[model samples]
Target: ERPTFYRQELNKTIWEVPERYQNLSPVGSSVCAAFDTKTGLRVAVKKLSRPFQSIIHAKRTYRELRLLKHMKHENVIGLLDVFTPARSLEEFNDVYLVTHLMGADLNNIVKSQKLTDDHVQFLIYQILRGLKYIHSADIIHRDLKPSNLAVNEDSELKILDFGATRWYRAPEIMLNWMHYNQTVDIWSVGCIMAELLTGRTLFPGTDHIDQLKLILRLVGTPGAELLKKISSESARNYIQSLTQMPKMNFANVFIGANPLAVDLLEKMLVLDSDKRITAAQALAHAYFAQYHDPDDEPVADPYDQSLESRDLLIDEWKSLTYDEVISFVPPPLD
Candidate 1:
């Protein structure tokens, strides 16, 4: 018997929905729907909301579509189609970009499993490889976090959410308007790596100021030599506050972690963004060198055939007591 295929028409466009799905929750900055059809295919439809705050956001969306148009990598999410109104609707109307839907994000996975060193290493390696590709394309994924990574049924990794990715906006871009670089993505990768090891964000500050504090507390304060180079008044003030903060040594916090892993993390977390390791440089780090093999089979798939509901994943994560979570590692370095 031939496999079944499901189709649905939304706003006059026919979309093939995967079999067995009833509805989709609001994912990220957009809303998504799951379609269950006979072909055993599962698809997600992301509908962009109308009335953006500024045209800059719309341009960024266009740029993201253009970037995805020419790039295709196993580690990167595949963009199947771009849906916009056949007729213009006042410029800021709803726009939709559809792509293949995957299973739980890394944040959800970390919540359930006590990720072994090998698991964390594998995830970090894949992230760096993906970032290398994005950086090669001159795109910077400013927001890199566990929630932004998707794991599909085949255990393949794909980076998602390009809305925050901005080009020529970093210190080099704003201060000197210098050529594009990849250090920004490296900083994000460091954040994600730290989250994987600790099961929580390394800098979980609520606002920009708090975020700077969190970063300073972990990486130590930058000295005047480094601060003098920043051109932005806001950036300078932020760094100034960081400089006054007491220095901390993260190496001591990850005492039980493999030395190589700790070393890589420290390099990526450098307080001076200019001096931080680039994504390509990070790929050559000894920590990744230990486990990365071009020929090795990919990590085992985490999505189960009889997959439990999303709520189950949430419950599994919530059941673990705070002590059980915090006890996994020592206190932050001071």
Candidate 2:
């Protein structure tokens, strides 16, 4: 609410940022919010304040820049601009990313309001649509939790946080992070859809083993093929000894929701990534009939590139920062 505004390098868009707003609304990952003074479009700027904090920040920043620079879709977060304080790449160390901001994340909405089938369908479709886009690009949003997702008053959602998103990981990635092609994202999509219908995480666990156990408890033990995929001998043995429970009663699990909605959840929560429904397939499910768009095919993303990452010595971050900044800008459109 200050009289001053800052410029977004993406379009030279002016955004309002004030000391009061920064102090009053510190958020997840300690995000800062801004307003589009011209179009009323809100924006969020994420800073890797101490990016060098991890030996991995360098990798994370590169993957995000690569994916966000080329990946464009309505449902995915828009990379309006990438800003850094270092005037020279030599001075670069920290990177600032700007994206279209939303009023709240799906997690916040689930807690605040009771979602209707329409709400569920709308939200699920957009997530799928967004996932479809990235997957088409041959990129997977490793992290698809509600907190990683942002939404507006109209119920429109945009996938954000590509640092952990495209490169960091999808929740399932940690288990065998490279488990499968785009199907990895589908697994998280299932978890997210479940949370929307019911206000809780579907598989809450402390670690990979515990998480697997939590999921096994509800969906029952995974099939032989999936268990075989677990290369860890101790983990496979532990799971074999645990009580093999039956799957949860979808009827009771989602009491107020549509039966079809529940059925889709079952397909998504399967233990075998091999059998999990692809985003394209999920978009065609019966549950989304109300919101289905014929033109909404999960088109392949031609720009999708492989994850390019490598570690940089802390000493090189400064020099690399300059190289990054220099490469980020095109060579004078010669």
Candidate 3:
């Protein structure tokens, strides 16, 4: 039997990776970590989950790969390599994305590590810093949370896991808004920011109704303009039916925290997405004054929005990914 390539089960699929990648271990739901013997580097290999299951799924896999390959930011995870063990489209069921591995995620850090004020400040700074670039590229992180943010001992953080369907989801999405913009991403950052400060989730809703209730409980009811923007008539009426709740005082909620931090949090957690503080504007806020540098903050060209359409066939998606992986030329040996 050929031993140069071996197969192992990850995320319920048999992954056949090169023998050069060794000591594989699970890092996430669909990701595994290994040491590349050829390069003498440790890497995280994420298996795109069931890309051919649907056009939507295929597009999602394509979009993430496209965005990761295109992005060049210190705070955003960079694509190191991408591959598929299969030789042709018929066998191309799994697409593995290789990225530089990091230590603990903020999810673990927030639970066990006692972070300092400076640590919190710098972490949030880097998050916004990375978001500034992402937003400039016409990309929304869509998933911003402790689990998606990996941190090193030096406090450097990188944003990973660009997608989600859970708690970090913004109110606009939960309210069934027909269209949402980058501000929804800002709302999630605010939730993560609050979690960093308090060492607990700001909104721990059990379901969508509870999620909205938890959000409304803190941010208050939506304004008339925002109500008009909601796509569902029942959802809008439901909001109208509820007794208006006043916004909570951040200072009281985050007692003894920096006033500037509280101020920025309030601006981000605004119920109306239109009024949420932008990533660029958040960087300028006094909360980050110690580390803020406008010159250091850079932006990128917008992503090709045309690729997001769902009209492409499954075979086209496979070929697109195939082209991308084959196009990746390895760095020359020293």
Candidate 4:
């Protein structure tokens, strides 16, 4: 019988790892490929680095496990299985996670695949719909990028790599990590949309400073009025130094894209996260008119967008995972 989800031995060899295979994750903490033995079932597993070495690392692990376990959206990748070194963790320590795999990430697709305008519309709409579910939980994806989004042969898209961080990082996060919200994700979708339309990254930065410069060049720098809201002294000073740029026309950048789509792009790429468009609004926008079904009622933004995260110590990290897991146990009939 096929396992909906199942655990395996602690040994890493259960699924053959192709030494020369193209691994998609930035962390590369583990291999992601097809499990030939299980009838070519594709699974991706990641192991946290320095799991016992840093509270920050452990905190990340805790958050990922918690989020994946709690998430039930069709577009979000949920936890599939758990693995440990021994029968009981009292005798062992590491845990491994297995998840359904896909053919390629969006980064690969955006780079190599040429799609018709219809394909672009279908893909972006899926992105917005997926994000609609993600933001509904009040949890910010924090990092949403081409590489983090996977696509299947069926043209189905799913958000992945909750391991998180950087590039797709919204400006608010750069100035201060603690202040951002769901709009950060909208910003990422904008970058991704541009890439999908053009077959190139919207912002290819050597570093965050350069990244900000690239974003400013295209989207135009924010005005002094908006700048005043910035709390970080360094970030504000850096912005003040740069010559302000006028926003470019999205249609010019995404030449050949639908005007309505370009219009949506402009709204999503708003420099101010607060004023940036929301997923539901984007879904309802005329750009998706043909694709948006009126019967498909858009989900409301999560009741709260204030879920806060912070660095933690390893011991504290361990407790949350155990507590979250203990809250629900497996039922009978197994």
TM-score of each: 0.65, 0.75, 0.85, 0.76
lDDT of 3: 0.82
User: What lDDT does each candidate get?
Assistant: 0.57, 0.66, 0.82, 0.68
Clashing pairs in 2: 89-322, 90-322, 136-301, 137-304, 142-169, 142-170, 173-177
Candidate 2 lDDT, tens digit per residue, 1-334? 1134233322222233322123223455645666544434456767654666666766565656666766667888756656655555555566766666778877676643556777888888988988888877777666677778788888888877534122213335666644557777777888777766776666667766666657666777766776777777886887688676787787787787788988898888776777788888888999998887868554654863433555567656445554554556421211
Q: Candidate 4, which ten residues in sequence have the lowest lDDT sum?
A: 15-24
Task: Tell me, by lDDT, which candidate is best.
Answer: 3
- Which candidate, 1 or 3, has the higher TM-score? 3
After superposing candidate 2 on the true structure, give the runs of residues whose Cα lies further than 4 Å from its correct spot: 1-31, 38-40, 50-55, 84-94, 162-178, 206-210, 225-228, 297-307, 311-334
User: Where does candidate 3 clash, by residue pair?
Assistant: none
- Cα deviation in Å at residue 43, candidate 1? 2.1
Residue 99 error, candidate 4, Å: 1.7
- Measured by TM-score, how close is model 2 to the native structure? 0.75
Off by over 4 Å in 4: 1-28, 32-41, 46-57, 83-89, 162-167, 176-178, 232-244, 293-334
Residues 1-334 of candidate 3: C-alpha lDDT, one tens digit per residue: 2236788776666888888788888866888988988788888888888877988888888888787888778898887777787776777788888876788888766644445677788999999999999999988777777778888778799988746246777887776667779898899889888878787678988888888889888888887887787777777778789898888888888989888889999999998888999999999998988999999999987789787675888889878977877677654442
Q: Which stretches of candidate 1 lie over 4 Å from their true place?
A: 1-40, 48-61, 81-96, 112-114, 153-155, 162-180, 232-247, 290-334
Best by TM-score: 3
